[PDB]
Amino acid sequence: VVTYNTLIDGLAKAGRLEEALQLFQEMKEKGVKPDVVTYNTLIDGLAKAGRLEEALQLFQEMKEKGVKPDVVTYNTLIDGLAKAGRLEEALQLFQEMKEKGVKPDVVTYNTLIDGLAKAGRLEEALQLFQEMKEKGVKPDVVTYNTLIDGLAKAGRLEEALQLFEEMKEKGVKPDVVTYNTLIDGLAKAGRLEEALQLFQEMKEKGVKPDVVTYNTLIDGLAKAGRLEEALQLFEEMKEKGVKPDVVTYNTLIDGLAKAGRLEEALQLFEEMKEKGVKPDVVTYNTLIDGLAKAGRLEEALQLFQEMKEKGVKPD
RNA sequence: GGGGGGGGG
């Protein structure tokens, strides 16, 4: 069953869901019984593929088949419903798991807190944070990161920083994601100097900046009118073997264009093409906006044609 | 062998 499970999971994660569903059928034919991991894996692949209804059929199928859902089953479904905007049903599954004696774990609480924060229901999220504490389910680096992000984005950056305090004090070591989240939140709140000090500090703590780190500061510097430093960090991260990705390029294209520096931006569009980093819908959209605003509408219309011709769907 | 957190228009 483990062979089929691993392949199924590999196929789903590569977007080859129909092959996955094929193998699921093969293993039943061949007398290799799906277990809870088989179903969990297919349910997670389907949800992530936009195919929540078929995922909900398989959940029904495993109960029909005597294969009891486990904490990972419920976590996977809760996260899928939450992301698809179905938070109320996710909250009802969380009630249902407790009623059935399937103990929620730190991932359960984390998933829910994230879904609640992103839905605007930060006070509820903070209640659950309280609740997991009273229930003896210890917050981990991910709980803290989730809350720090939710707070900052709700414009509650002071709490967010208190919480970074609490975290360090209870021996939860901030990781690259913590630093990345706080850097973005500070930058977006116009506290760019503190964000650049945190950049220095994570390097001192041996917590290596990653692409997300550089992307975040690059954007933060661009929008603050510090394009030269932003272009400096671009060169730097390359010199340090941290590969610019599509986001890095789009960010820099957009900052060059709003700064009046469109031929540089069109240069990078070329450059990323050369370097096999494929422009995505955000790339095209940024370029089209920049060209239009510079009075180069004929060229923006031509790019719109190009993105469609190349299968990058306009949104 | 399966589930949760950070960056761009």
- Look up the CATH number of the domain holding residue A284: 1.25.40.10
- Token pair in block for residue A1: 């069953």
Do A12 and A38 contact (CB within 8 A), yes or no?
no
Cα gap A137→A28, rounded to integer Å: 38
> Which nucleotide comes closest to A251 if you measure CA to C1'?
B8
Q: Note the resolution in Å, 1 decimal.
A: 2.0
> Which nucleotide comes closest to A287 if you measure CA to C1'?
B9
Which bases of strand B sit closer than 7 A to a protein CB?
Answer: 1-9
Interatomic CA–C1' length for residue A67 and nucleotide B2, angstroms:
14
Interatomic CA–C1' length for residue A213 and nucleotide B4, angstroms:
21
Helix axes A87-99, A71-83, angle to 10 degrees: 170
In this structure, are A194 and A260 located in the same domain? no
User: Cα angle vertex A202, ends A197, A207, to 5°?
Assistant: 165
Residue whose C-alpha is closest to residue A43's, from A77, A11, A75, A71: A77
Local structure of A262: helix, strand or coil? helix
- The CA-to-CA distance between both ends of chain A, in Å, stands at 41
Do A199 and A209 contact (CB within 8 A), yes or no?
yes
- Token pair in block for residue A159: 């709490």
Residue whose C-alpha is closest to residue A280's, from A235, A238, A249: A249
Q: How many CB atoms lie within 10 A of CB A164?
A: 23
Do A153 and A185 contact (CB within 8 A), yes or no?
yes
Domain boundary among A180, A211, A241: A241
Q: Is A300 a domain residue?
A: yes
Residue whose C-alpha is closest to residue A77's, from A112, A30, A34: A112
Task: Give the range of the structural domain holding residue A255, as residue numbers without chain letter.
Answer: 244-315
User: How far lies A45's CA from each of A3, A176, A265, in Å?
Assistant: 17, 27, 37
Residue whose C-alpha is closest to residue A192's, from A224, A214, A161, A160: A224
In this structure, are A314 and A251 located in the same domain? yes
In this structure, are A309 and A259 located in the same domain? yes
User: How far lies A197's CA from each of A116, A162, A201, A202, in Å?
Assistant: 31, 17, 6, 9
Amino acid whose CA is nearest the C1' of B3: A76
In this structure, are A237 and A248 located in the same domain? no
Phi, psi for A31 (deg, rounded to 5): 75, 15
> Which nucleotide comes closest to A314 if you measure CA to C1'?
B9
- Token pair in block for residue A214: 């550089």
Q: Is A140 a domain residue?
A: no
DSSP annotation string for A123-137: HHHHHHHHHHHHTT-
Into how many domains does chain A fold? 2
User: Cα angle vertex A293, ends A290, A299, to 5°?
Assistant: 65
> Which nucleotide comes closest to A43 if you measure CA to C1'?
B2
